[PDB]
Design a protein around this ligand. Structure first.
Ligand SMILES: C=C1/C(=C\C=C(/CCCCCCC)c2cccc(CCCCCC(C)(C)O)c2)C[C@@H](O)C[C@@H]1O
Ligand SMILES: C=C1/C(=C\C=C(/CCCCCCC)c2cccc(CCCCCC(C)(C)O)c2)C[C@@H](O)C[C@@H]1O
Lengths: 9, 238, 238, 9
C-alpha cells in the first residue's frame, strides 16, 4: 500500500 | 441543544467536505476523455481515482481518524472507499434526468455510460434506486457529511484491528447526527433511522461492486486501463 | 541484388510499422491532457503507454520474434522498449523547431515539456542531439524499420536466455539492412556504420532514462501518475 | 508480467 501510505501523509 | 464538542465536530467535517468536493467539477477536463469495448473505462477509472484522493483528504480530517494506526486507516479506507464515492456522488445525482450531471454534454452521466465501463445492471439498478432514495431524504450539508464520516468509521470491515476505538469514534459521530436532526431538522422525526438503513444498502452495493471489479481486474486488457491508486485501493493485497 | 527472403522481411516490417504508427496522431486526444509540479507527467505517461502497445504490435510481426519464448519476448521488450520509442519518435521530430510535433498547439513538444514531466537535461540534451543526428541520416522507411527491428533483437540485454537465436535473427536482419543500403541507397557508402553507431547512443540514452525512471518510480506521488503497463515494462520484476 | 503476456497474445 505504497500510494495509500504517501497520501495518508 | 447541541454542545461545543458536537458543534466543532460538525464544523471540521463540513470544512473538510468543502476542501475535498468541487461543485464546478473543473478537474474533470484533466481525466482521459469519455467515449460513447469498455470505451467509458479510462474516464471512469480517472474519475474514481481522483475521488479516492478526495475521500483520503476528507478522511484525514474526520476527528480521530488521524490517531488510528496506518494499518486501520488503510483497512477502513479500502473497505469503505466505494461507499463514500457512492455517498458523495449524490450531490451530482439529479432526479429530473436520473443521472450524475458533472458538466457540459460530456460529464452528464446516465446509467448506459457505466455499462460501457465494465459494470452491469446488477450493480447499477440498485445504485440508481439508492441514489433516488438518498436524494429524496433532502439531507442537510451536515447530515450528508456526518453519514460519510459514519460510513468511513464502520468497525465491521475486513482488516480492522481496533474495532473498539473505531466503534467509539463512530458512536460519538452517530450521537452528533442524532442530536443534529432533533435540534436542527424540522420533520426529521424518522430521518436518522432512514439514514442508518442507507448504510445497509451500501454494504449490498459494495459487495456487488467488489464481484464486478474482480471480474474486470482479472482481465489484463481491462486492469491496464485502471490507475495504480484504483488498483491498490480495490486490490486484495494484505 | 536483394533475394526474395530479404525482400519478404522488408515487406512484413514496413507493413507492421504502417499498422502500428499513425502519422495523424489522432489517438492523442484520448490521453490525459498536457498541462504547461510535474504537470506534463500524466500526458507523457499516457503517450509512452500507448507507444509501448504499438512497439509490442510491431514486435509481434518482426520475423522470428513470435517463435522466441514468452520469457525472451518480454526480456527483449522490457530492455529495448525505451530505445524503440526513441527511434520511432524521430518521425515526429523536426529540425526546424527542435521538437516532436504531433498536432495542434497541444501536441507540439519542446524539450522544456519533458522537464515538466520528471526528466532532466542530462537525458534530454543527448536525446535531442541523437534526434538531430538520426534525422540528418535521411533514412528510408525500410532502414528506419530495420534499425527498430535490429534494436529490438539485440542479444546483449538483461534477462535474455537464448542469446544465440536472438543474435542469429539480428544478424539475418543486419544482412538485410547492409544489402538494402548497397543495392538501394545512393551515397549510402557509410550509412550502415552510422546506423550501427546510433545503437551505441541508445544504450547510453537507455541507461540515463532507467536512473531517472527509478527516481520518479520510487516516489509514490509520481508513480501513481504512471500506467500499469509503463509500471510493468520499466519495473524491476524478474 | 500479466499485461505484457496478454498483449503478446
Ligand atoms: C465519483 C463521483 C461522481 C460520480 C459517481 C458515480 C457515477 C459515475 C458515472 C460516470 C461513469 C463514467 C464511465 C459512481 C459512484 C459509485 C459507483 C459507480 C459505479 C462503479 C465505479 C467503480 C469503477 C471501478 C473501480 C473501475 O470498478 C459510479 C461524480 C461527482 O459526484 C464526484 C464524485 O466523487
Ligand atoms: C512516443 C512517441 C513520441 C515522442 C517521444 C518522445 C518525446 C516526448 C515529448 C512529449 C513529452 C510530454 C510531456 C520521447 C521518446 C523517448 C524518451 C522520451 C523522454 C522520456 C519518456 C519516458 C517517460 C517515463 C516512462 C515516465 O519515464 C521522450 C511522439 C510520436 O513520434 C509517437 C512516438 O511513439
Amino acid at each position: 500500500h505504497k500510494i495509500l501510505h504517501r497520501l495518508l501523509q | 441543544m447541541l454542545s461545543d464538542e458536537q458543534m466543532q465536530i460538525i464544523n471540521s467535517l463540513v470544512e473538510a467536505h468543502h476542501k475535498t468536493y468541487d461543485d464546478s467539477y473543473s478537474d474533470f477536463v484533466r481525466f482521459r476523455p469519455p467515449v460513447r469495448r469498455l470505451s467509458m473505462l479510462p474516464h471512469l477509472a480517472d474519475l474514481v481515482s481522483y475521488s479516492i484522493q478526495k475521500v483520503i483528504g476528507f478522511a484525514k480530517m474526520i476527528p480521530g481518524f488521524r490517531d488510528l494506526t496506518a494499518e486501520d486507516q488503510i483497512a477502513l479506507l479500502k473497505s469503505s472507499a466505494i461507499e463514500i464515492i457512492m455517498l458523495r456522488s449524490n450531490q451530482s445525482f439529479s432526479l429530473e434526468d436520473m443521472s450524475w450531471s458533472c458538466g457540459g454534454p460530456d460529464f452528464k452521466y446516465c446509467i448506459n455510460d457505466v455499462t460501457k465501463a465494465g459494470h452491469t445492471l446488477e450493480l447499477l439498478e440498485p445504485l440508481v434506486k439508492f441514489q433516488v432514495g438518498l436524494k429524496k431524504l433532502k439531507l442537510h450539508e451536515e447530515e450528508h457529511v456526518l453519514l460519510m464520516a459514519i460510513c468511513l468509521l464502520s468497525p465491521d470491515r475486513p482488516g480492522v484491528q481496533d474495532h473498539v476505538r473505531i466503534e467509539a469514534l463512530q458512536d460519538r459521530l452517530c450521537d452528533v447526527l442524532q442530536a443534529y436532526i432533533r435540534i436542527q431538522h424540522p420533520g426529521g422525526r424518522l430521518l436518522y433511522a432512514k439514514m442508518i438503513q442507507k448504510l445497509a444498502d451500501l454494504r449490498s452495493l459494495n459487495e456487488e461492486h467488489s464481484k464486478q471489479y474482480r471480474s474486470l481486474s482479472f482481465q489484463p486488457e481491462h486492469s491496464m486501463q485502471l490507475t495504480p491508486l484504483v488498483l491498490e485501493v480495490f486490490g486484495s493485497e494484505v
